[model samples]
Target: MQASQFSAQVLDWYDKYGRKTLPWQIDKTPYKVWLSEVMLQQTQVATVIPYFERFMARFPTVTDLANAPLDEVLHLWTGLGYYARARNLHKAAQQVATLHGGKFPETFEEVAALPGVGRSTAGAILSLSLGKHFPILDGNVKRVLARCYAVSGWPGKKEVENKLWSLSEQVTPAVGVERFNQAMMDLGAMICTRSKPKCSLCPLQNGCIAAANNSWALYPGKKP
Candidate 1:
């Protein structure tokens, strides 16, 4: 199938089977979305939910976060590992307040300039919250694309990551791109799990080159 066709399948899967009730999905804001994307970096949904809840309760807006002390911000992030994300988020919030009028940067370049936002995270913040058509290549997207295309090499490899990002840009659809991005995350968490993938329930199962060749493990290789 073509890239458009592939993205279409993901969108359909999202509408019916994907996660729709996360804390970030309710009472949504760009700041909330940005915070969730960062919190989710090295953690699971179950773990992030409570921390996110507490953080939101404490800092309801970007301005609140900007005004809060680093001690308070870091305290809220207790046990959330990756202290740098919290630190960067704290500074980024301050940057938004002082530099960007308490508004999340709207453009890709400026959003990426935030202390912790990477290209993938910036793409996610824009598309998932702003309805922009940007591509994301997170672990979930990386796994799905790596297996579908049977891409070989560690994702940590710049060359391999570059290929996956290229495929992500190609397959991400302008139509319902947010749904497609969420679907990929759900796909990784549910069907395409790290240890045991339920390929039978996957929309891309028929088209997955790794499944067809019985070489799923060969695609997403580990680093040297």
Candidate 2:
């Protein structure tokens, strides 16, 4: 499918079924978006909601998180499983507070330079929060793209990831990028799931190569 068509379908799908009521989606800020992105790296939305609520209640801003004690941060993050995410979150908040005057950095390089933030995470934060047109390749996005295009090879490898990134960049529109990115993620989570993807209900089903071939399972090749 053409890149334009892909994006258009995604946007349409977003308007119809994409998730719009997530806590971070309201009163959005770079900090809230960034925190949600970090917390969601390993956890599902339902799981992250309460922790996110608590965190927001305690630390309303990047400066507040920076000024708070590490113990307190970790204390709130106790059940999240990955303590490292909290540690890096704390460290990154300090970087933002001290280096950027408590504002999340606007540039890609600066945002990615923060601790624990990778290329896709930086892209998500900037695109979702600032409406910037950067392509994101998170796990959900990767699964959707890989299966749709029948991309072979595990995404953990540099070459596969680069291919997915290129496809993401190509299909990502210059307008309504935040909604498009969210739509892609929603498509993955809801329709193009890892097991038994609902291809009949997917917006991209008509153009999806894996669905065409009945080979969705072979795509996003298994990790070796």
Candidate 3:
């Protein structure tokens, strides 16, 4: 299916099953969204929920986070693994407070320049916090895109990742940045999963090239 069609399908699925009750979803505040995005890296949503709640309860605002000690921030982020993300989050909080007047950067380039903010994270911040039309191509989105298009290459490889990034940008809708980002993630997490995907329940099943061709398990083309 074409990228636009794929996105439409995902959005439809999102309207029905996409997560609507996430803490970050309730408030698209830049600080809250950025914090949740950082903590969610390499972590599951179920695991991040309580941590997000606790951290937000402690440091709900940018000023609150900026004023807190680094050790305290790390302490809250302890069980999440990838301690470096927490460290950079603390550092970035201070930088935003100092340089940006305690406001999260609105532009993708500016956000990406912050510590621990890569392309995917930047896109998420832009879409979720700023309501901009940026698309994310993280591991999950890359897997969905690769399999849908039958792109053949290890997704981690630079060339393959670059291709997927381009496609991600191309596929993102003009509106619905928040819904689009959430849908892409949900589709990846629930339908286009790593192991045996539930293609039967997939919204894109009708046109999914991988599923139609019996290559759903392999079309991501990643090397083990």
Q: Highest TM-score: give the candidate number.
A: 2
Q: Which should have the higher TM-score, number 1 or number 2?
A: 2
- Model 2 misplacement above 4 A: none
Highest lDDT: which candidate? Answer: 2
* Candidate 2, 95-125: lDDT as tens digits: 9998999888999999999999999999999
Q: Where in model 3 is the C-alpha error above 4 Å?
A: none
Evaluation by lDDT, superior candidate among 1 and 3? 1
Which pairs of residues collide in candidate 2?
none
Residue range with the least summed lDDT across 10 consecutive positions in model 1:
188-197
Task: Kindly give the stretch of ten consecutive residues in candidate 2 with the minimal lDDT sum.
Answer: 183-192
Q: TM-score: which is higher, 1 or 3?
A: 1
Q: In candidate 3, which residue pairs clash?
A: none
RMSD to the true structure for each prediction, in A, is 1.1, 0.9, 1.4
Q: Which should have the higher lDDT, number 2 or number 3?
A: 2
lDDT of 1 by residue, 1-224 (tens): 58878988888888888888998987667798999999999998898999988988888889999998899888878898989888999899998999899887889999999899989999999898978999988887788889999889888778888888889999988878878888888998788877778999999987889889878788689877
Q: List the residue pairs that clash in candidate 1.
A: none
> After TM-score superposition, what is the CA distance of residue 5 in candidate 3 from its true location, in Å?
1.9
